[PDB]
Amino acid sequence: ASATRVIQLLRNWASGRDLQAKLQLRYQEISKRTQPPPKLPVGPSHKLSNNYYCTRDGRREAMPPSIVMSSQKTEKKAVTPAPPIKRWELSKDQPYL
Amino acid sequence: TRPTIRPRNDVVHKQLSAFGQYVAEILPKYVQQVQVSCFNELEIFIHPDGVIPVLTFLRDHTNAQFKSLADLTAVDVPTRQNRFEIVYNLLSLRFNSRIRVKTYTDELTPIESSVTVYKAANWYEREIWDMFGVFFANHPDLRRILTDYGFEGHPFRKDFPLSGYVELRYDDEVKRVVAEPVELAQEFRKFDLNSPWEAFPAYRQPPE
Amino acid sequence: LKKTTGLVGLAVCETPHERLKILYTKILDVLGQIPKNAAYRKYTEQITNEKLGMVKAEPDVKKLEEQLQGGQIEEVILQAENELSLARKMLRWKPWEPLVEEPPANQWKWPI
Amino acid sequence: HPAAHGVLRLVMELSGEMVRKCDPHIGLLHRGTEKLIEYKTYLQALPYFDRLDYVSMMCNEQAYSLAVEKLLNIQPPPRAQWIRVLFGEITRLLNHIMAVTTHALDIGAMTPFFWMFEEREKMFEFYERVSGARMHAAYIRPGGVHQDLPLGLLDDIYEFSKNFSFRIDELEEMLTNNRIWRNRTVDIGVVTAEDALNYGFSGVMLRGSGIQWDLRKTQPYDVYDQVEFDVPIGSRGDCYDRYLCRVEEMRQSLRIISQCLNKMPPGEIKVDDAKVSPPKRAEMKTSMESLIHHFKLYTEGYQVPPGATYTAIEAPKGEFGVYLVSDGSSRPYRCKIKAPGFAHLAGLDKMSKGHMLADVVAIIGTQDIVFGEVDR
Amino acid sequence: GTSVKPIFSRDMNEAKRRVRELYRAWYREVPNTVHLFQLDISVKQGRDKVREMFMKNAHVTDPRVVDLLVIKGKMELEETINVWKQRTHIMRFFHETEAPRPTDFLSKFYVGHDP
Amino acid sequence: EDNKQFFGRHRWVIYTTEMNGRDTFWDVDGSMVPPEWHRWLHCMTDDP
Amino acid sequence: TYKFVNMREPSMDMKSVTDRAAQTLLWTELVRGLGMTLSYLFREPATINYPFEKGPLSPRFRGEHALRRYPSGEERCIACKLCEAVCPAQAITIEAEPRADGSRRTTRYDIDMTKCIYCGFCQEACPVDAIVEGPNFEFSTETHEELLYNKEKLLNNGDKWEAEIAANIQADYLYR
Amino acid sequence: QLIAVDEKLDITTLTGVPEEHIKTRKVRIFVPARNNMQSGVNNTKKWKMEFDTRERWENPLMGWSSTADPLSNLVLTFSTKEDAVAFAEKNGWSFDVEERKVPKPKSKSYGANFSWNKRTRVSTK
Amino acid sequence: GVRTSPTGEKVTHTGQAYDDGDYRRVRFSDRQKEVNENFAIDLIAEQPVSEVGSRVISCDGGGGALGHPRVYINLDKETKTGTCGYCGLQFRQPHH
Amino acid sequence: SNLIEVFVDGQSVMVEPGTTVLQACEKVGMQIPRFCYHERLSVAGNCRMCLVEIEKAPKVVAACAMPVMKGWNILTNSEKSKKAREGVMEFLLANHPLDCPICDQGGECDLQDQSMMFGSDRSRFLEGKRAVEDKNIGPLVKTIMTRCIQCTRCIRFASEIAGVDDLGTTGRGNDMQVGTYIEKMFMSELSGNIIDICPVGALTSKPYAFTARPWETRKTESIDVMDAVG
Ligand SMILES: CCCCCCCC/C=C\CCCCCCCC(=O)O[C@H](COC(=O)CCCCCCC/C=C/CCCCCCCC)COP(=O)(O)OCCN
Ligand code: SF4
Ligand code: SF4
Ligand code: SF4
Ligand code: SF4
């Protein structure tokens, strides 16, 4: 910034913080608008062998949903859709705001 | 498999299959089918009479506790005798699980309103009526929610035209906005995209 | 004892053990009017008996909450009330009967 | 109306300035998105989700991409998932800034809006650098992301992130301890946990009443199970607690952004499956299979196996879900869009009982409603 | 038996009674609609238009369809009474800006290809 | 150019008073910038 | 893991009670807010002097559409109609026929700019880099008709903006 | 308890369709013919419903193709012919149904290319 | 290679000019008709035919990945030159 | 009857003697990938796209030419069949020109569709491609022979259906070419059907060239009135 030191001190007193440390104007710390070209690495399937598509075909491994107790067609403990959710733990970083 | 293929979760698959068996055993009067998809989503098919008992059981049972109605919508399949597929999506916060309840209806058969089970169902049922024409009996206030006042037809039906039947413009002679039959300067261009070769042999149907 | 449940509208319940015992006894007595071979009756009786046995065997509220896996026993009381209401509604509905009707030949066929 | 967000016709019955009844009339921004999607390929239908919630664009892109990927049974590469989470947290920052500043504007604190929209402009610069568009980027696609990050983007994101905290501090200095703000927000629109659950609420509208629920924690997606953050919880279920929760969620998003910046891995950006994701342009101009797959993916698109899924994420406004039905072809059969704003505005009349006109304005502000997702 | 679930009415007589009640409500409402919306038409024109709209569906013989038509008519009346409709919506029933399309064969032959 | 200004004020153009056919002493607009200086001015590149 | 936002209790000692009473009677937090606004008053504003100064953009930026040429002056477009097929808004209308020398070229190439969503799907689908979204965004008009571009308008846009377009593509083609 | 209606299904009054597009439309029910440019047959499995073609004209500006019938792009898919017929009847549309065409089974024999005395013998491979 | 019609309207590269009796001319009154002056057919006609010493030549339009898909052109016929289907450049084997 | 019993992926099928594997597969509603096979032409068996695995048989067979034996179990979606299809498509695409944007067959190409369905998604061919000169066979059928895959469908149609023996192959190996070997016009009242039978854009309609794409055309089924055949 180009503010005089007296105005800077007035700003810090009014805000109660060191304003020059964190500036909203971002003068020169940003990256250059011109950059070197990027190499850009390939995916795992860029192989010359052992790469048949039938071994990596996720779309063709989908199948219709499993049918459970269609209507057309002991102990027997009760069940839940999933195990009960575990209780959350209070934060160690900052439990109370 | 590995890098590009979605991994499986057998534990959730067995848990959902077991809970579907549980629900089917508890409510044989209404449950017609239970399905588990390969990405671990549980679907329960019910008779239309069982909309209220099944949802109430899933909300209030200690082992179900599906206290949240995530979504309620309809799907239009004109080829079926019962045109409209009514889909309920529920979430259980106690058990970190989701469930889907599905039923059916046609143009003239009312479906029971679920506002007594879930208060969220009010606007969802209003939207289903507005978009598909499915009437919900005992709905506290059923009326159009998304369409213009006086709008005729149900746009989300498969036989409703994409651009509708009427368009709006301002007319200076009558000093108001008027509605007139649609004319398009450019007609929407229909594309035939489907390949004549079958893609997924796992879903091939019998040749009749 | 506890100052707040942390959930809006859920008041702190003094003497939770007696409330839970009363609610579970009411649930069992309502289930007693349901046919013996009904799956709902047997499943709910099993889980209610387990919870009642846990309640009768632990006087500490925090450890009872830990055992019940129910999240702050006030919510356990609310769940028991919901179960009692569901039991009465189920007794009215009689869902243990055979399927009311079969769907149309191709009602659930997808695709198309 | 300045407080009606442009397209909300709220029919209210008043006794004096006390609000007897709230009857929200919607559809003034209903464009028939769900019917239009049926006439598009999945790639062609992707940009609609940018315009569903136009304050959280990449989050809707991520939700739709996850639904399509789940139907396709494919997996995005790890670097794409890390970029998705980083940009989703940036989007959460943008959304919470918009929500808080517009809320304060409706009550009357008009100054923090100007302070925070400069940060919003910098985040739009990030979107434009990564995708070429300021808001409707369309960067997140089924299979990964469209393009890799340009060199130098991470450094600028780090520079912005190391300073956003002081802007949060200045906002919180202007609003949190002010007695006028507390008088306008404390004990206004109080909702109980049971009512919130039964009315279909999600997100902050659930966490403000003490419900411990967050989809990024309970049902993690992408790499959200690899980052550490806290979930703010309210206790009074009112406007002030939800304000505090949103501010703390901004802080936690900054924390997640730091973790994502330090953990960015190398590798490809879209799934290495040319039947789903288009190949690189050099490959398309060099090899026969790449050209064929480019042609077919940009004319017909990829076929999706038949099935129906409901995929939901923790959007900045709540649970954003898609019920996507596939009939086996390259065009979706049905696409139902679930918006938290729908249910939240459906519960507006319940929350406004016993309150006044300004209180109803504050409740509209605290529900964090954008009508693109409400009307669709 | 045809095994169909009803909506409101068991047969056509109760459907006719509901139709008559809806017609009475619309007939009562018409003058208030003319006054509130500041319409340039007369009360007789509005009541004639209501009669025309009712007689448009006179051929219906299915009680369920009649019940749904009555439900839609009550929705329209509730929209009109609450002034949710505007003057444009009310005047859309009259088609005042659409040219009268001829019905005879020769005129259709002259104007274009539509049957 | 003035690199001591913050990002956005470090580059600016003083428009001409007479372009192709019109007097632009007061009537100036952003479309008067030629493409190369358009690229430099909008910081799409660091090279004039 | 979670945290509470409004679960702190104020101390009831005479010191704290007197401090709170002084806060109530003397309006200290209001003065703090005034001080923050005064601090912002003396800061340098973020306003730029448009149109003399411009907002920063990227080579990836999507602006006005243009049709490009080969270095010989030949049109790059080969009427493959990939952009028309992929266009999510159906904003592209293409007709083609063999040219007088037998070349595959367009006779109609229209982009309805009021239908367009500027998504860049068309320039992705193009296999010969013929259709691009340029860097220009200042092309507002006074009539609707001026925003219905035909092939001549797009070719003129390409001829007018090629110097910037080629440089923008050169900086980004290795990311594509 | 049920009411036992005894009339054929008709929902024309509830669909919001103008009278012109109910009584003057002709829908065709058919299985689409195989595109002869390709050998794939996956597009000849289902039944289709399409409306009669109406007038298209050039727009005075841009020379685009204009239309005035809202049903010019409406295509429905059915699993059987009876489902399509029922849909058309309950919607009140006059329909024409074309029977499905299946290619007849054919007798292919590779050895016939090299016959001792028949004309099926090929002069080239 | 712009050319004017007997009415004075500039004929575009696609050859479309309004008929003298066409009312649609009125849209250009008090305004102009947008016409691109760089006719691509004439521009590609000015390019010389490249002499190469092989029966098959490769063309990608120049610029590597900034051109068009790479195609291979047969040059066996001495009666006619080998033209690229993408770029329009011409190639031939040494004769005479 | 005289029918024999065969299995297609374990499903019993009753077929007449002399039925091929391809026909048995199509009786259960599966279409075997094919390039050279046309049900109205003679069986060629050259493209090798229809190779399929028979259970308990080490070597895959050509489904278009092989009569199915009783008790055979045709495994149409096993690893062997899929890898055979991928290899055949790789060999077909090795020398094929990158002409899809300028090819009229684009969007309705059997090569494209069967590459998308049964082939791999990338290339490992690192050599140069072959290019052949074009043949002038008339003003109706446009000829770009670099796209030819040597199916020989056109030759068989000319010989058998049109009764004209003017088409053939010259050379051998990679240099085999489809044409007339002389400047000759294939002018016949049925000559235009070679455009339809050709799977690729090697033979295309000259009056229709470059004007449209398959996905944008609307199909109207009608009747021809140019003669009394209907
Ligand atoms: C030895 C004998 C001495 C005799 C006695 C003298 C001692 C007197 C000591 C006490 C004096 C206190 C005077 C203050 C009067 C009002 C203070 C007050 O309490 O008002 C506030 C409310 O007042 C406000 O907060 C102001 C609201 C509007 C703010 C507008 C801007 C703030 C002012 C900016 C700076 C003020 C400068 C004023 C002077 C300018 C120069 C002329 C109370 O509201 P609540 O906190 O909500 O509590 C109510 C329930 N308990
Ligand atoms: S940018 Fe998108 S909407 Fe615009 S013309 Fe290209 S593809 Fe169409
Ligand atoms: S602009 Fe590109 S994609 Fe569009 S038709 Fe021309 S060559 Fe094809
Ligand atoms: S024949 Fe088929 S694969 Fe070959 S260039 Fe033409 S469209 Fe592409
Ligand atoms: S021209 Fe066509 S039909 Fe003839 S051999 Fe070549 S690809 Fe086969």
Ligand code: FES
């Ligand atoms: S189809 Fe059998 S080898 Fe060609």
Ligand SMILES: [Mg+2]
């Ligand atoms: Mg062909």
Ligand SMILES: [Zn+2]
């Ligand atoms: Zn070239």
